[PDB]
């Protein structure tokens, strides 16, 4: 119950947030952007994943 709520809040998208539509080199700077507060937790973003 708590874990699925944490996921459903974590993986979603609102149409306007911080860092809307920026580009990311991977998951690591996704974490550095969220935990610094520059970009929001959910904003649609092109990333590079392997």
């Amino acid at each position: 119950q708590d874990v699925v709520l944490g996921l459903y809040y974590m993986t979603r998208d609102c149409v306007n947030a911080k860092g809307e539509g920026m580009v990311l080199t991977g998951p690591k700077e996704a974490e550095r952007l969220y935990r610094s507060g520059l970009a929001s937790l959910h904003a649609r973003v092109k990333v590079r994943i392997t």
């Binding site: 708590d2 874990v3 944490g6």
Partner: protein
């Protein structure tokens, strides 16, 4: 004092039997934890048997579910009281209301999973304030019968214990009032007579080597149950008439 009450709290507080309701109002003459002494007004007073009212409060005593039913005065010295007005709050009562628990600041949020299914998570600010620290009273009992091997004794001398285990006892073998005991301490030193040990081989060899008499008695003393603490607050000694009463009795 429940901040969100329903107004039915005063009827349950007064009209139960735990609090002390004034039967004749007046001016409060004397306030103590033991008793409350009321000077009755002139108009509410009978012509014969004049007097004043006295209300003996019930102090720390045992309830049936091992909790501590207690009464505490809520009125001060020299205060006007109405007829039918509360004077002594009982257990879980504040000022003649019904205070079953306590009111606390609550946040509804999932906090790192510690509130997973239905769990509650409490700060140390509650336990430092002792605002949920409750008082229980247990009643341990030690009976002393008459077996057909001999009668039992309540003497302080116990076989094969230390003096540090017996320093919390008196000269009569019954524990002092107000000594904090833990699990395993001896409250009532009681020994039962036994005989016919039926010792084995090499145990009988050892006895022969060291000459130690296997004693004619057995430690069946009353002990604290495994894993509690607390204070001895009240000791009673019931004795059959025709038997020597010891010193603490």
């Amino acid at each position: 004092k429940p901040l969100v009450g329903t107004g039915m709290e005063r009827a349950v507080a007064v009209d139960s039997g735990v609090t002390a309701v004034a039967k004749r109002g007046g001016v409060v003459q004397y306030v103590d934890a033991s008793r409350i002494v009321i000077k009755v007004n002139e108009d509410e007073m009978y012509p014969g048997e004049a007097g004043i009212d006295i209300y003996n409060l019930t102090k720390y005593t045992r309830s049936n579910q091992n909790t501590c039913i207690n009464q505490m005065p809520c009125v001060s010295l020299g205060e006007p009281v109405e007829r039918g007005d509360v004077l002594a709050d009982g257990p879980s009562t504040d000022l003649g209301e019904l205070a079953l628990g306590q009111n606390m600041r609550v946040a509804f949020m999932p906090w790192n999973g510690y509130n997973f299914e239905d769990s509650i998570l409490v700060s140390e600010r509650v336990v430092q304030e002792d605002r949920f620290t409750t008082i229980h009273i247990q009643e341990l009992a030690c009976v002393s019968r008459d077996t057909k091997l001999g009668p039992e004794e309540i003497t302080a001398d116990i076989p094969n214990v230390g003096e540090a285990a017996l320093s919390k006892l008196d000269e009569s073998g019954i524990v002092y009032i107000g000594a904090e005991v833990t699990g395993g301490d001896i409250l009532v030193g009681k020994v039962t007579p036994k005989g016919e040990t039926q010792l084995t081989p090499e145990e009988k060899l050892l006895r022969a080597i060291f000459g130690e008499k296997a004693s004619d008695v057995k430690d069946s003393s009353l002990r604290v149950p495994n894993g509690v603490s607390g204070t001895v607050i009240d000791v009673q000694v019931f004795t059959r008439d025709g038997v020597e009463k010891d010193k603490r009795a």
